[PDB]
Scaffold this active site. Sequence first.
Site, PDB file in Angstrom:
ATOM      1  N   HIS A 168     -11.739 -15.594  29.482  1.00 13.44           N
ATOM      2  CA  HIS A 168     -12.376 -16.928  29.651  1.00 13.44           C
ATOM      3  C   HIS A 168     -12.909 -17.123  31.085  1.00 13.44           C
ATOM      4  O   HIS A 168     -13.615 -18.138  31.294  1.00 13.44           O
ATOM      5  CB  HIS A 168     -11.520 -18.094  29.149  1.00 13.44           C
ATOM      6  CG  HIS A 168     -10.291 -18.391  29.939  1.00 13.44           C
ATOM      7  ND1 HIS A 168     -10.331 -18.895  31.246  1.00 13.44           N
ATOM      8  CD2 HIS A 168      -8.991 -18.287  29.617  1.00 13.44           C
ATOM      9  CE1 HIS A 168      -9.097 -19.083  31.665  1.00 13.44           C
ATOM     10  NE2 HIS A 168      -8.259 -18.728  30.677  1.00 13.44           N
ATOM     11  N   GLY A 212      -6.043 -22.739  37.899  1.00 14.60           N
ATOM     12  CA  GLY A 212      -6.309 -21.479  38.629  1.00 14.60           C
ATOM     13  C   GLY A 212      -5.164 -20.468  38.553  1.00 14.60           C
ATOM     14  O   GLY A 212      -5.319 -19.364  39.123  1.00 14.60           O
ATOM     15  N   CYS A 238      -4.284 -19.006  35.809  1.00 13.39           N
ATOM     16  CA  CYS A 238      -4.635 -17.999  34.766  1.00 13.39           C
ATOM     17  C   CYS A 238      -4.669 -16.571  35.352  1.00 13.39           C
ATOM     18  O   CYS A 238      -5.116 -16.324  36.502  1.00 13.39           O
ATOM     19  CB  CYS A 238      -5.939 -18.315  34.070  1.00 13.39           C
ATOM     20  SG  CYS A 238      -5.722 -19.706  32.956  1.00 13.39           S
TER      21      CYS A 238
END
Lengths: 304, 304
Positions: free
Chosen positions: B40, B142, B144
């Site tokens: 993503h 952030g 991820c």
Amino acid sequence: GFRKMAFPSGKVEGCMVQVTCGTTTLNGLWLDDVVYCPRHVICTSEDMLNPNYEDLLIRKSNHNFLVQAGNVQLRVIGHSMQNCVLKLKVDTANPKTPKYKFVRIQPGQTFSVLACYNGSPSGVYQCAMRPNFTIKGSFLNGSCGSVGFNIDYDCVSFCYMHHMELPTGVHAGTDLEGNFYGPFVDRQTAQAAGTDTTITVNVLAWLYAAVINGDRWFLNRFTTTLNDFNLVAMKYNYEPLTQDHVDILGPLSAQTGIAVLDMCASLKELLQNGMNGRTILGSALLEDEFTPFDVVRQCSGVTF
Amino acid sequence: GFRKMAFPSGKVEGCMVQVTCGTTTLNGLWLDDVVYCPRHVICTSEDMLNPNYEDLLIRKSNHNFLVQAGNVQLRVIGHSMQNCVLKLKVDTANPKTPKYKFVRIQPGQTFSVLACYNGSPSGVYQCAMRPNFTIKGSFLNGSCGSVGFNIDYDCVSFCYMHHMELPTGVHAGTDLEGNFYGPFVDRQTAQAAGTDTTITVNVLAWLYAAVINGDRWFLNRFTTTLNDFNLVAMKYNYEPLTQDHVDILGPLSAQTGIAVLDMCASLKELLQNGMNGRTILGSALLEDEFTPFDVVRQCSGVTF
């Protein structure tokens, strides 16, 4: 989501070594060409009741200290005592030496512990320095010489080295200059820790954390004064709150729009009424081992 | 003393990098000459509702990925998609690559998370994989590409990469081959997690921990059967217990001299009567995020 979070341990892992003296093994901290470890490594089972460390250290030669850094056997070329720490001068500077400082922390402050056995890291967890200068750690036999630390920017600030378990099952240790936190001595004798108190500013920080994580049932419309709050505080063995504490909580207050003295009224109600079987951040008790800095880091995402 | 303990994080810290695609920054895992990150990263705000990842990835060039390892800018020389992960082939092998494995963990197992922002480690904590394939982590925007891991001997076993927060505030992510744990998809859509249950074998391990730490008030003279225990289990949303669970608990049973079915009778009483304002290991609730292995490591002192 809000967890007890430790600092990343890598920079400390590369400093951990094994220190053997006779049948006693514990851990040391290898910085530059010096290994720091608890001086009780030199004790026999017998010596531990009432050791004369000056006389015991005179007995010892560099060759009585077996220091391993993983595979490497480090040669000890000098030994000396600073307070309750042994400094073992070694022939090799640690190439994994991080940037570091030695700091003496205040009661109520938190740090990460890298629990070690045989000079090998086992695990990392957060601790507070209790107001009575003990810590509620997790430490087995041979964990001595494990250290506590904070990281700022890129610098490791060593604040704790583990020495002992008290009768109560709490822990005592020194700063990296060998000075005990609290009244404790490195002697296998019954030693009283003071009455402990709850770290009020930390319980308030954690109530702020709960509110940031939208868990806000305990909020009430009331305010209070330091003066009147401190009456309830003293009743429930909570540390008194100062304007310094209020100033320290400003970022979480300003972040949340809740005045410190408004949060203090919510804490008053919780102490008097209890939690009625409700939880705050998935806990059924008031948590006091997160500092305001700890909450801000977890709720703002500070990195190193 | 008994704490939530994370694995030492050093070997993972040296693998963490920053991955930017447009205005989206998150973290990647740099092993050998491949950076692994959530796919993503390639999405715009708009794409995230119903992304066609195949078409979006075709749009992208190696030059649309800015990868930093601290100071170094890593040149991406190839990009490909495996399930929900992006593999970014880079021109440099990570010299800090530890020995590693990719493993798909079971629900009820624990791992350490190194929470990262901008490719910088912020902190390390223990998580369980919930029976409903979510995790109750601590993750800000952030985070991820932060990974979960175990260490055996000297080998890092990567089991989790962070992708998303669910409506409920729990977390979802993939194994390092890009397969989600549970029914989740990498789409910004309302997604149901199942009913979650309590990990019974873990609550029993933690009751064993409590007994090892001499905290044994909850013990009763009674026994039970898997059959009869599992009746109460189903009533209180606890996972059923199997003989495999009983066998897994043998070391803690044998260590303590308490039969598993005897501990199970104590758990039955706790579920029915609650804790009467008593605590177990300084908790007012039953803890289910310690595995039997976790308790044995903390109560036997396993190192890496």
